[PDB]
Amino acid sequence: MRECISIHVGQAGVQIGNACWELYCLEHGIQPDGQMPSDKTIGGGDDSFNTFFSETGAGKHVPRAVFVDLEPTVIDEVRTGTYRQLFHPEQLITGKEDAANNYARGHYTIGKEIIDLVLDRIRKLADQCTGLQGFLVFHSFGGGTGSGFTSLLMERLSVDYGKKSKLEFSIYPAPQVSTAVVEPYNSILTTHTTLEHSDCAFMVDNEAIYDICRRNLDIERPTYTNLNRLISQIVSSITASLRFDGALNVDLTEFQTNLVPYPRIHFPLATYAPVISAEKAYHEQLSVAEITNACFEPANQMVKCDPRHGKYMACCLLYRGDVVPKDVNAAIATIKTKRSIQFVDWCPTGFKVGINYQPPTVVPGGDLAKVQRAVCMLSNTTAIAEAWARLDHKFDLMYAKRAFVHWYVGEGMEEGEFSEAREDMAALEKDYEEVGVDSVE
Amino acid sequence: MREIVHIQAGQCGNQIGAKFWEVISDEHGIDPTGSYHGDSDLQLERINVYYNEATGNKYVPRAILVDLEPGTMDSVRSGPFGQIFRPDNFVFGQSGAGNNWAKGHYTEGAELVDSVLDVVRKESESCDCLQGFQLTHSLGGGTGSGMGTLLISKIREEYPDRIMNTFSVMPSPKVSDTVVEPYNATLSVHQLVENTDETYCIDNEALYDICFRTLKLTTPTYGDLNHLVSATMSGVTTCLRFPGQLNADLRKLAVNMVPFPRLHFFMPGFAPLTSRGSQQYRALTVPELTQQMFDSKNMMAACDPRHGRYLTVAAIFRGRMSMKEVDEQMLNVQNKNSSYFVEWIPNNVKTAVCDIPPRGLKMSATFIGNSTAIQELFKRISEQFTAMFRRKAFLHWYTGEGMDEMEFTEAESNMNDLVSEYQQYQDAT
Amino acid sequence: GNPNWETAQMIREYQSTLEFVPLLDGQAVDDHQITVCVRKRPISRKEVNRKEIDVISVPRKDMLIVHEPRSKVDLTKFLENHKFRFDYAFNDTCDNAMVYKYTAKPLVKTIFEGGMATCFAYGQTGSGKTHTMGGEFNGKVQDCKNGIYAMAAKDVFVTLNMPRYRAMNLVVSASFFEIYSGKVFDLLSDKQKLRVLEDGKQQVQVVGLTEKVVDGVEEVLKLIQHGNAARTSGQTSANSNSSRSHAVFQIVLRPQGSTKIHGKFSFIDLAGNERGVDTSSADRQTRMEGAEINKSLLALKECIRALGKQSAHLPFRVSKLTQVLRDSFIGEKSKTCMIAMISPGLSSCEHTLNTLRYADRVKELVVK
Ligand SMILES: CC(=O)O[C@H]1C(=O)[C@@]2(C)[C@H]([C@H](OC(=O)c3ccccc3)[C@]3(O)C[C@H](OC(=O)[C@H](O)[C@@H](NC(=O)c4ccccc4)c4ccccc4)C(C)=C1C3(C)C)[C@]1(OC(C)=O)CO[C@@H]1C[C@@H]2O
Ligand SMILES: Nc1nc2c(ncn2[C@@H]2O[C@H](COP(=O)(O)OP(=O)(O)OP(=O)(O)O)[C@@H](O)[C@H]2O)c(=O)[nH]1
Ligand SMILES: Nc1nc2c(ncn2[C@@H]2O[C@H](COP(=O)(O)OP(=O)(O)O)[C@@H](O)[C@H]2O)c(=O)[nH]1
Ligand SMILES: [Mg+2]
């Protein structure tokens, strides 16, 4: 049976893992103590699907999850919370000190000597599965372990596994609001191994989801509990075809074939249709043509990024629930008519529709409610290049002044590592200028 | 987990420290006898940080007390919490410093540092992993200026990779409680540039100002100036001890907060500070805490922050909050104050949000900020110093204890280079 | 035949594209208050037996270009044109005598004009530092006959014996250092930590420095046999050894009735972390001394760029390697030299570019 290995890294990765595994346990019926008392009433069905859940003989279910953060403070919430007895008790903590927001403590100093517990734990976990693999990595750019330790975890998993698909779901630094002053240093050093090893890098952002939680959801004070559920609804309908029974399922290998033209332009900028309130769950039809047109306006992109100032290359409409496959093509010939939704010449096909027909469920405790259908559009546009130039500019403004850099080179890393990461991002931004421009004859 | 050793030098040091371990105790819910009688189970997870265990359910702070020259001994022992410190830690001698630097660093310090470091090593190896060495000392004095910076010359020597925070009470432009005071500041800032990762510049005038201009206290005693310092001292290590939503160690601060290795002299703020009974005419919200933190009359270093550009600042928020009102209030201040910050840094402010408030409050904060406006605390001393040193005024009480004239010119050359590396970034470019 | 020939195929095509005007010995020397020396070593005998591609093109006397095997977004290989400007760009055909035009240097003339000057030696392992300063081009015993430290010893000692300069009655004194993690030792006695203070007349003096009034040329080169006696400072590695501290071998110009010095002349061994930092080694002493080398090297890069791009906040007390050498930089009739060794190989192309951009922070634009 096809399966994934969800490897959360950092505090951002573990905090998202609080709610991704809160969502999975409610869809399948698994209580916070491993049992399945929902399907015992009916008496049939293996709904704790082996994509995400190892099953032991005593009826208990164990996830495929391992997470490393180099700080006990985050995981001790998991080891004392509601999901204490659910997970396996090897949630790898062992950090005698936090990374302190740098890539050099990090890829080199304390990420090493803890990685020996990490890779052996994945080998003890990967060898229980027959069939498809895929590493669902969860981290953030800008942090210390989400940037540094993931970079060590990719070059040590692109060797012991080779050509396996790696979907890594990174939280990207916002161009206007940054919760650290050294976050432009970490989010340029982590690109040098995201570009090489991880085949598909889902970037989301915190400011573009703040506006969604204010405008659509109408929440005036959104905490980090209410942001991570919206990423959790996205991550569910990315790996929904591996579990549920759809009319057009899209495997994790079918992303790599479709979303990714060239081996170094894999940054596809997820979206969703979260216009539930749920006061506005009435007053509104929410048909197939409605939720597909939610991707038109740049007030619903999950990244602070304007798609109208760039081409598209390839999109991937992934539906949920009561979707009829006829209504989809009405909502696609419409989009290919609109002249600001701009494509390149070299991709005339455009779209790809994955219709799963299990409806998205509702986490009790807010903040949206039971809609009958959804969409998670994944589209690598050319417009993500202007989202990086507002981050190379933050790097270059404090690289001329030689600021903050004695805590990077005084931890094992050489000071020449920074310009090696600048010559990628200068040349990787140069790649998006060529691909969007068509050739004339 | 991550563990801190607290050292107390100078008579200013343990007086802050005796109030310090009362704020820490009531934050964890711990009685004078060390017996835990707390409300919840959430404040036992990091007792390990400040309080190592004892035999029957009792907790002892890892508090070395260098400063108990015996005039202060039987007041700290005969105090509120004299039955909480381990009595072998009370390390002292006889014939204290005499408001003299050379009688802290060269003569009585050399015959006491061996008895201190024999207890420092016995409190390091009773720990899983150390990072923190808090030193509560004061400039200007005797023990707190010569012997307080003799240990940092030794403890950083035996531990080159620990975060060394020294909450250094500094002299004042008007309040002159020591005649020799521009000597004990020049000779001690010369030590605290080389040997610390961070050091907090606290003055008594800006603590006298808050108790009159804001807290409206009739007679602010010395307890009520230390009760404001200690509310910052338990505000830097909050994310160590308590869970949060965006944690910050003593090292995520001191990697962000410091651009260049000499520019680590901080000014600490605190909010909410206000004066009431139980009827106060306001509302504790996230935009309410923000304006008070950045207000120029709620610093502690007694310099004008609008005279210079903030290099970078850190706002360690506590209590239950919302991260959008945190990340957007920290944005609008940076835009309204575009000249008051440094232009050539992307985002200056960082955020740190814990999840447990203080006992009585609903929310709180701590403004730790690195500014070029602290050039004024070093220019005033360097004018008072070269006025005294030109006449060779008080030097025969120092050269008569072993020093030389060529260490005084070494110390003023180092402090005058901080002012050069603060006037630069205060200028625009 | 060769597996990697194609990357080198475009390299053989690039060498006919531009105009090769290299550096020949005997050209004029301008002022150049701050010089940056970059030397390319020749191809060794092991490299041709290993299929090694030369990737270091030297087209000018002030320009050096390094190629790199990369790919487009269509998996199409091309060569990146790393374009660097030096002063002083040297060929691999350069013998040490052509380097003697520029490193047996006219700054020793500045020593005798009442000014002071210094010189640096930066590089990686297997790059030519074994043939320049700390041991020279000689083989099984690297003794000082063929490289810089021997020939500069003839520029200092023998030149002042001219009667214009011999009438000044000037003598020679030497003094060796050891710059550890905030520690300024002496190589005459290993257990002598000397404090760095400063007199009231604004001269940073290492307190209590022992000198020797020595000698002719043949004996002053044998002082390093006492200098490298301690094997500074406690190496524990694979390719033993590589110095963790830094050596400052000062040669001082002074008269006899003096108590008056002008013409301090110093050599620096910028030896650091060439091999990657063994963080698998759980020895805490390695990280505590391996870290402070890099922050000392960042001090020396940062200090010189504020000397070229002049300002009034000149960074000195970030470490002690700059603090000891504070007087020799800020002299009025003072100049500064800095040497960078280069490794030819493709397998060390990542370690070569790190050494090149280290010697780039004087802001030289490629006018071309
Ligand atoms: C009815 C009510 O809400 O009363 C408040 C109160 O009125 C005010 C004015 C308190 C009060 O504080 C002071 O008046 C004060 C006295 C000396 C030095 C500093 C302050 C209060 O005494 C202080 C007390 O603080 C705490 O309980 C905190 O946990 C605080 N604790 C201590 O400082 C402490 C005092 C005695 C014994 C043990 C601990 C703390 C703060 C930071 C870190 C750890 C602990 C609080 C909220 C109040 C009173 C009781 C009136 C204020 O101070 C603090 C520290 O909260 C002064 O401005 C704030 C705003 C509060 O609303
Ligand atoms: N959406 C979301 N973002 C988070 C969360 N926690 C942190 N972040 C963001 O992640 C970035 C900070 O990185 P962290 O993950 O906190 O850092 P870390 O990986 O623990 O690394 P160090 O603390 O530096 O060792 C900032 O941009 C935060 O806004 C979270 O729970 N949810
Ligand atoms: N905040 C505070 N300042 C103090 C206290 N006691 C002394 N001072 C200040 O400390 C300085 C005098 O040094 P002191 O600690 O008494 O001298 P020492 O015993 O030689 O270190 C002066 O600036 C005093 O205002 C105190 O309990 N609290
Ligand atoms: Mg963290």
Residue numbers in the entry:
A (entry chain A): 1 to 441
B (entry chain B): 1 to 429
C (entry chain K): 246 to 613
What does the paper say about this structure?
Like all kinesins, kinesin-13s posses a highly conserved ATPase motor domain that is essential for their function. To address these questions here we use cryo-electron microscopy (cryo-EM) to solve the structures of Drosophila melanogaster kinesin-13 KLP10A protein constructs in complex with curved tubulin protofilaments or bound to the microtubule lattice. We solved the structures of three complexes covering distinct nucleotide states and tubulin conformations: a complex formed by the NM construct bound to the microtubule lattice (straight tubulin) in the absence of nucleotides (NMMTapo); a complex formed by the NM construct, bound to the microtubule lattice in the presence of the non-hydrolysable ATP analog AMP-PNP (NMMTAMP-PNP); and a complex formed by the M construct, bound to curved tubulin (CT) protofilaments wrapped around microtubules in the presence of AMP-PNP (CTMMTAMP-PNP).
On the other hand, in the absence of nucleotides (apo-state), KLP10A does not form complexes with curved protofilaments, but binds well to straight tubulin in the microtubule lattice. In the NMMTapo complex, the nucleotide binding pocket is empty and the electron densities associated with switch loops regions are positioned relatively far away from the nucleotide site. In analogy with other NTPases this corresponds to the “open” configuration of the catalytic site. Thirty six residues of the neck-domain are resolved in the NMMT complexes forming a loop and an α-helix at the back of the motor domain. After product release, the motor domain would alter its shape to the apo conformation that it is no longer complementary to the curved tubulin structure. This would lead to detachment of the kinesin-13 motor domain from curved tubulin (state 4).
